[PDB]
């Protein structure tokens, strides 16, 4: 898909 804007905080 596309990356969500705060993805890094949920990895």
């Amino acid at each position: 898909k596309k990356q969500k804007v705060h993805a890094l905080f949920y990895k």
Epitope: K2, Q3, K4, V5, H6, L8, F9, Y10, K11
Partner: antibody
Framework: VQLVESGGGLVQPGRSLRLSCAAS????????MHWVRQAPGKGLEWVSG????????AYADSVKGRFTISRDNAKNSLYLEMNSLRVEDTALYYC?????????????WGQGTLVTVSS | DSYELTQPPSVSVSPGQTARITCSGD??????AYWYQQKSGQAPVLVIY???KRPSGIPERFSGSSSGTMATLTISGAQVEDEADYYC???????????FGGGTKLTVLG
């Protein structure tokens, strides 16, 4: 549900402030929390963010090395330690919270606390 | 300067007409766009997430799309209460930057 910021004030360049944000009415989910600032009459700027367990932290390039974010869920509080303040750090500072898993980013906002850096 | 999202500074629409606000960004093909509405003296409110999804409580006249390097917020049948500043928000692929567009002042002409 409520976010309430405090700690803003007037300081000279090079000095420090510590902002706080008290959260009320939230259950214990994985939503990340953030600081977003806005200079008078100008646009929004993301400043810093922190994961639910504080394991992941990030900063805008403009504040890296000067600002430090932290979070103590036991006191329902979010903090921003701002050191080596610059005139261009002058802004209204908002605290904000994501919905779970970051699906709705910055879903909840406070009212803002005013920071003025002036010589 | 940093990674940049570009918006028109101002858009004006007559009541009942369709308003379109664009947001151009090089990483938009690979990263979702989000839109915030901010009225004078108020905190921002999320109105569109993940390019095209509407949060609960947001009227159906609000819609979003993204194609290539441009995201668009559309308000079909603009109402006077829609007058506000609108900001797009996204990240670059590396996740190094989370940035807002410069904002668009939407005037619903009165």
């Amino acid at each position: 549900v409520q976010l309430v910021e405090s700690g803003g004030g007037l300081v000279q360049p090079g000095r420090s402030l510590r902002l706080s944000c008290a959260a009320s009415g939230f259950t214990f989910d994985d939503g990340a929390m953030h600081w977003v600032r806005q200079a008078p009459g100008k646009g929004l700027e993301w400043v810093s963010g922190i994961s639910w367990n504080s394991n992941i932290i990030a900063y805008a390039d403009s504040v890296k090395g000067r600002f430090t974010i932290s979070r103590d869920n036991a006191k329902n509080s979010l903090y921003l330690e701002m050191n080596s303040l610059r005139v261009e750090d002058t802004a209204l500072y908002y605290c904000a919270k994501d919905s779970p898993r970051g699906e709705l980013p910055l879903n909840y906002w406070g009212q803002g606390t005013l920071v003025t850096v002036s010589s | 300067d940093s990674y940049e999202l570009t918006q028109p500074p101002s858009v004006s629409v007559s009541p009942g007409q369709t308003a379109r606000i664009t947001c151009s960004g090089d990483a938009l093909p690979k990263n979702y766009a989000y839109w915030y509405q901010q009225k004078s003296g108020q905190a921002p409110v999320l109105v569109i997430y993940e390019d095209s999804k509407r949060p609960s409580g947001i009227p159906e006249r609000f819609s979003g799309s993204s194609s290539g390097t441009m995201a668009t917020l559309t308000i079909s049948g603009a109402q006077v209460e829609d007058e506000a500043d609108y900001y797009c928000y996204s990240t670059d692929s590396s996740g190094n930057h989370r940035v807002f567009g410069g904002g668009t002042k939407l005037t619903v002409l009165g």
